[PDB]
Design a protein around this ligand. Sequence first.
Ligand code: CLA
Ligand code: CLA
Ligand SMILES: CC1=C(/C=C/C(C)=C/C=C/C(C)=C/C=C/C=C(C)/C=C/C=C(C)/C=C/C2=C(C)CCCC2(C)C)C(C)(C)CCC1
Ligand SMILES: CC1=C(/C=C/C(C)=C/C=C/C(C)=C/C=C/C=C(C)/C=C/C=C(C)/C=C/C2=C(C)CCCC2(C)C)C(C)(C)CCC1
Ligand SMILES: CC1=C(/C=C/C(C)=C/C=C\C(C)=C\C=C\C=C(C)\C=C\C=C(C)\C=C\C2=C(C)CCCC2(C)C)C(C)(C)CCC1
Lengths: 737, 160, 41, 84, 218
Amino acid sequence: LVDRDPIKTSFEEWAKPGHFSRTIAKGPDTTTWIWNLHADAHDFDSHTSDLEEISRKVFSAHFGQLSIIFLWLSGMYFHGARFSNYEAWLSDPTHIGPSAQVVWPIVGQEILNGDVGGGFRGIQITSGFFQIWRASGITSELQLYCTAIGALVFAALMLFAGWFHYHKAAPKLAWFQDVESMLNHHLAGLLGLGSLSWAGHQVHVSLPINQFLNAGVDPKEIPLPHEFILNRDLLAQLYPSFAEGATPFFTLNWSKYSEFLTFRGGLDPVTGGLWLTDIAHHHLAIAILFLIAGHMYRTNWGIGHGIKDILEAHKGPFTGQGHKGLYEILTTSWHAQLSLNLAMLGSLTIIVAHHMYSMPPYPYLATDYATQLSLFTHHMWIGGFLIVGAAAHAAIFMVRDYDPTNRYNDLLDRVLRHRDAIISHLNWVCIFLGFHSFGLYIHNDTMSALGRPQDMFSDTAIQLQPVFAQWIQNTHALAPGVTAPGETASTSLTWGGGELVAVGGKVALLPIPLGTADFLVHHIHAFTIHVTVLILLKGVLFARSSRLIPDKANLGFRFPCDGPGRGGTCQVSAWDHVFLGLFWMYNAISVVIFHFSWKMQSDVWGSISDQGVVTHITGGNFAQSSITINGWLRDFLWAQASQVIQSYGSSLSAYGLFFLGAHFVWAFSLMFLFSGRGYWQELIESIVWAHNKLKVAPATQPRALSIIQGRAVGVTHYLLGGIATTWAFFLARIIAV
Amino acid sequence: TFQVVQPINGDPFIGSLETPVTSSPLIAWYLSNLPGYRTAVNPLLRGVEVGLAHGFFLVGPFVKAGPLRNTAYAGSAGSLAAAGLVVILSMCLTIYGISSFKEGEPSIAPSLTLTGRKKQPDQLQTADGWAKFTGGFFFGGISGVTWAYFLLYVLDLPYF
Amino acid sequence: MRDLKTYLSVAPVLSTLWFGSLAGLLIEINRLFPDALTFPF
Amino acid sequence: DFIGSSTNLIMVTSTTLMLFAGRFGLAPSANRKATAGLRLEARDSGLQTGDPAGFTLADTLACGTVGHIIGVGVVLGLKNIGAI
Amino acid sequence: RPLWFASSQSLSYLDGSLPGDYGFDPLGLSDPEGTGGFIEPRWLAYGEIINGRFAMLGAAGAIAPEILGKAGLIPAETALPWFQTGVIPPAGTYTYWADNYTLFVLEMALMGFAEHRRLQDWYNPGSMGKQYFLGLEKGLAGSGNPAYPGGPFFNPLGFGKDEKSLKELKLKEVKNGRLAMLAILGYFIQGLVTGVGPYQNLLDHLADPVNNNVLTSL
Ligand code: CLA
Ligand code: CLA
Ligand SMILES: CC1=C(/C=C/C(C)=C/C=C/C(C)=C/C=C/C=C(C)/C=C/C=C(C)/C=C/C2=C(C)CCCC2(C)C)C(C)(C)CCC1
Ligand SMILES: CC1=C(/C=C/C(C)=C/C=C/C(C)=C/C=C/C=C(C)/C=C/C=C(C)/C=C/C2=C(C)CCCC2(C)C)C(C)(C)CCC1
Ligand SMILES: CC1=C(/C=C/C(C)=C/C=C\C(C)=C\C=C\C=C(C)\C=C\C=C(C)\C=C\C2=C(C)CCCC2(C)C)C(C)(C)CCC1
C-alpha cells in the first residue's frame, strides 16, 4: 500500500509563494496577502479535500519534528561536554552549581559569567540534566560526545526518512486506517520493549556505577561500564546473586534476585532520591504489563478483538444506540484524534509535574530547589497549553467534519439536544464557587482592616479544616505493614510519616501539614478550573448554531462577527472562545504556581543544624499570612521581589533586565486588545498621503490588521509578557537563596 | 428498546424534556402539595404557611454567625436581625405585587392541565391575591421568628 | 539554477542575510573600538 | 530433582490443560469467536493448518502463552504462602 | 505441488513460477498489492538469490582453513577461526602484507565497481554491453534475467543447456542457498555463546553428546 514517486522533487514551487492555495498564489495586491500566507501554512485540510493526501502530508511533518528534537538533544548533550563543569560537579554535587553555558565578552556582557564552583565561570542551568547524567552512570565527557554524535546521526536519518516517505514511496490511505495494528505495535514494541531495554541498562550499568559513587569512590577510579559485563566477578562481588546467572529466572526462583530488585519505598539517605533497584523493578514490571497489553486487537490471524465490535456492544436505556458509529468518526477525521490526544497528553503532563516533586527520582535533585521549581512550573504550563488546544481542535472538528447524514452517532446527538441545561448548571456552579471561595478572602481583609481578628476564617478564630485530605494522609502514612505488607516505608515522605531526610545540611522532604489556608486555595483552584471548563465547553457546544445566529456553521470556524445587528454579535465564533479561555488558563496556572512556590518555601525547604532544628526560607508564615489578599501582596510579592530588583551589577542582572522587558511586553499588548481596526485604517490614510507627496508610496497598499489577527497578537503578547515576568522573578528569587 | 427521557407532554418542539427528576411520581406528588401550587385555596393561608416556614428558618444563621454570637445577647440580636430581614422581604413582595399586577384584570395563570383538562386559573396572579399572599407571609414570618426565639431561649431544651 | 536564485531574492532571506552581515560588522567595530562616548577626531 | 519438582508438574499441567481447552472448543480460538453472551461463534480464519478441527499455529501459541502465564502465577502464589 | 505452511492469502500470488516455491509467506510480504520501495516481489527474489549465493561462498570459507589445521596440512598460524582472523581486531588479529584498513579500501573499490555495474544492469537491462570497458563489454551484455545473466563470463562451461535441467539446477541452487544462510546464522550464534570455533563445536559434540550440548552450554 505505497505509491512510487507521487511528487517530483523540484525547486519550482519555492519561487512561487502561496502555491498551496489558489487565492494566495494570485499575487500581493495588499499587505493582507503576506499575513494570510503564514496563517494558512499548515492547514492541510484547506489545501485539498483528499484524505489520502492529507494523511501523507501529516506523516512527513512528524519526521521533521523528530529531527528537530534530535538536534535539540544533540546540542544539549554537546554543551555539557565542552562548556560545562560536569566532572567537577560530580565530585561535589552539594556545593557546586551546575553550569553549561559561557558568554563571549564583547560589550561588558562577560559579567554574566559568574562563579559557580569548580574553577568555572558561566551561567547556572536549572534543567536538571546533570542529575539525569549521573543517574545513568555517565562519568567522563567522551560518553557525552558520543551521545551528541549519535543524536546528530539520528536527526539526519529522521530528515532522510521524512523526505523519502513523501517523495519516493508514500503509503496509501488503507495503510493509515489500520488502527488495530498501530495500537498493537505502539503498545508491545514502542513502550514495552523500550521499558525492557531501559530496565536492562539500569540493571547492567546504572546500578554498579551508582553504588560505587555512593560508596564515595573517586569517579576516575570507577571501572568502565563494559568491565561489569566482561568480568562477571565484579558483579558477583557487588551482587552475589549474579554468580548464579539466569538459572533462577528460568526455574521461577525469582526470590534470589531480591538483592537488586527490591520493594523498599521512600528515599535514599545518601542522595535524597528513590532507590534505583525499585526503579529497575518498576520498569521490568511495566515492560511485562505493556507487552501483555499489546496482544488484544485482531489482525491477519483471527485471534483478538475488533474495536468496532467492542464499541457497538455498549448502549443503555438512557443513551439509546450508544457507541455505534464512533468507530467511523475516529477513523476518518484527523481533528478529533488530535483533540483527544492533546487532552490526554496535557492531563498526563500535569500528573507528571505533580508526581515528580514529591517523589524525587534523581540523585541530589530534592536539594536543588531551583531545578524543582523550574520543572514544576514548566510542566504545568505545557499541560495547560495542551489542554486548551484539545478544546480548540474539538471545536474545529465540530465546525468542519460533523455530518449526521453519513456519520450519525446517538451519543453526540443526545448531548447537543440539551446543551442549555449543561451550560446553565455550569454557570451556576461557577458563580457559587466564585462567591464562596473568593468571598472568604474579602471577608478576612475587611475584618482585619476593621480591627476584628477574632471574626476571621483562620486556624485561631473560625477553622475550616480539610478533614477529608487529612484522612487520606493518615491512611497513606499507615499503609505499610497493614495494607501494603511488602513495603518497608511509605511511597512519599509528604504523607505524614514523621521521618525527615536531610542531605548536605538541607531539608529534602518532610511531612506537609494541611490547614485552613489550603482549603481556601484548593477551592480557588477548583473555581478557576471550572470557569475555564465552562468557557471551553460553551465554545465547543455552540459551534454550529444558537438561538441568536441559527446559521453559525455557514460562517465558518474563524470569523469575527455577524454585524452590529441583534444588539451586537461580537466574538460569537468558536475561535473567540479559545481566545477568551487562554486568559483564564493563564490565571489558573499562575495561581497554582504561586501556591506551590510559597508553600514549599514556607513549610518544606530549609536548613538543618547539628542539633536538628529546621529553619525554613521564609520562617513558616504561610499559615497566618496567606488568608488575606494583603498578605499575598506583602509577604509574597513585595518581600520576595527584592532579589530581582537588586540584581544589577552582578551575574543575575539578566533576570533584572528580563523583568522590565516582560513588563513592557505585557503592557504593550493592551493597545491591540482595547482598540479597533477602523481607527488604525483611518490613521494610515494620512500616512500614505505624505508618501504619495514624495513619490515613495508602495504598490503593495498598506492595510491595517484584521480583527482576528489583532486579537491573536494581543493575546500572544499578553501571555508572553506575563509568563516571562513570572519566569524572571522565580529564577532570580530562587537562585540567590 | 425502552427509553426513559421523553419530550415534554409528547410535543418534541417545545423547549423542555421529561426526565425522572421532573416527572417522577414521588416528585410530582411532592411538588403538587406545596402551598405555592395549591391553586384552589385562599392565597392568605398559603402565604401564612410560607411565612411561618421561612421565618422559623432564618433565626439560626443570624444567631450562630452574628457579631454577638459569643456574648449574652446572641439570641435577641439574631431574632431582631431575622425580623428585619423578614420585613425587607415583605417590602420586596409588596413592591413586586404593586408593579406587576393591575386592579380589575383577570388572572394570567394557565388554565389547562397536562392531560388537557380545563381548570380555573390560579388567583395568586392577581392584585388582590398577591396582596393577601404578602400579608399572610408577613404575619407568618413574624410568628415563626417569635416561636423559634421562644423555643430556643425561653425553654431550656437540651438542644445540640 | 534560476529557481534557486529566485528563492534567494525573497524578502525574508535577503533581510536575514543583510541583517546578519550588518550585525557582524557592528560587533567587529565595537570589538576594535570599545567604550566610545564622544567623537575624538 | 527439578524434573520431578512441583513446579515442573504445575506448569506442564497448566500448559496441557490450556491446550486441551483451546483445541476441543472449551475456549475461544481463530475459528471460534465469543459473543456478548459468552457463546462461541463459528468463524473461518483463512489459514491452512492440516488439522481436522482447524487448530492453527497462532491458536497453539496463544494457548501455550496463557498456560505459561497461569502456571507461573500459580507457582509463585504457592511459593509465597510457603505451600510448596 | 508440495506446500509448506501455505495460506489462502499467500497462495493468491505464489502460483509456483519462482524456483523453490512452496507457498510459504505467513506475513504476506510478497503481496503484489501496493508494491514500492524495496518491498517488491522481484527485488525480494533477487535479494534472496544474492544472499543465498553469498552465504554459500561464506559458509565454506569460514570453515575451510579450520578443518585442514586439525588435519596437519596448513601451518597452525593460518588455521584460525573466522572471528579471530582479523574481522574483529579486539577478538584477535593477524598481520598480513598490509594493514587491515588499507585492504578495506581496495576491497571497497573493487566491490564498488562490480556492484555498481550489476545495479546498472538491473536498472536498465542490456546497458553494460554498450560502452567500451577494456573490450570486455562484449560478454557483459546479460540475458534479460538479472539473477541469471549467463554469457561466456558467468557461464563458461555452458551448463543448463536443457530448460528442464536448468529448472532443476535453479531449484538446487535455491535450496543450497537457504541451507547456507541457516548455516551462517548458526555460525554467528554458536560463536556468540560458545566462544570457540564451529569445527571445535562439532568435534566436542562428537566427543560426547550429553555433556557438550545446548543443555550444558546455555
Ligand atoms: C500537536 C499539537 C498541535 C498541532 C499538530 C496543531 C495543528 C494545527 N493547528 Mg493548533 N493548537 C495547538 C496544538 C496543535 N495544533 C494548541 C496546543 C493550541 C492552543 C494554544 C492550538 C490552537 C490553535 C488555533 C487557535 C488554531 C490552530 C490551527 C491549527 C491548524 C493550522 C496550523 C497553522 O496554520 O498554524 C500556523 C502557525 C503559525 C502561524 C505559527 C504561530 C507563531 C507562534 C504563535 C508565535 C511564537 C512566538 C515566538 C516565540 C517568537 C519568535 C518569532 C521569531 C520570528 C523572531 C493545524 C492543523 C488553526 C486552524 O485549524 O484553523 C482552521 C487555528 O485557527 N491551532
Ligand atoms: C525607503 C522607504 C521609505 C521612505 C523614503 C520613507 C519616508 C518617510 N516616512 Mg516611512 N515607512 C517606511 C518606508 C519609508 N518611509 C516603511 C517600510 C514603514 C513601515 C514600517 C514606514 C512607516 C512610517 C510611519 C509610521 C511614518 C513614516 C513617515 C515618513 C516620513 C517622515 C520621515 C521619517 O523618517 O519618518 C520615519 C520613518 C520610519 C519610521 C520608517 C522606518 C524605516 C524603514 C523600516 C526603512 C525601510 C526601508 C525599506 C526596507 C527600503 C528598501 C530599499 C531596498 C529595496 C533597496 C518620510 C517621508 C512619517 C510621516 O511623516 O508620515 C507620513 C510616519 O509617521 N513612515
Ligand atoms: C541516550 C540517547 C541515545 C542513545 C540510545 C541508545 C544507545 C539506546 C540503545 C538501545 C538498545 C541497545 C536497545 C536494545 C533492546 C533489546 C531488546 C528489546 C531485546 C529483546 C529480547 C527479547 C524480548 C527476548 C525474549 C526471549 C523470550 C521471551 C523467550 C526466549 C528467550 C528470549 C531471550 C529470546 C542517542 C544517541 C540516540 C541520542 C539520544 C539519547
Ligand atoms: C517524554 C519526552 C521526552 C523524552 C522521551 C524519551 C526519552 C523516550 C524514549 C523512548 C524509547 C527509549 C523507546 C524505545 C523503543 C524501542 C526499542 C528500544 C526497541 C529495540 C529493539 C528491538 C525492537 C529488538 C527486537 C528483537 C531483537 C533484539 C532480535 C530478535 C527479534 C526481536 C524482535 C526480539 C523529551 C523530554 C525528549 C521531549 C518531550 C517528551
Ligand atoms: C498431540 C500431538 C502433538 C502435540 C504437541 C503439542 C501440543 C505441543 C505444544 C507445545 C507448545 C506449542 C508450547 C508453547 C508455548 C508458548 C509460549 C510459552 C509462548 C510465550 C510466552 C511468553 C513470552 C511469556 C513470558 C513471560 C515472561 C518472560 C515473564 C512473565 C511471565 C510470562 C510467562 C508472561 C504433536 C503436534 C506433536 C503431533 C500431533 C499430535
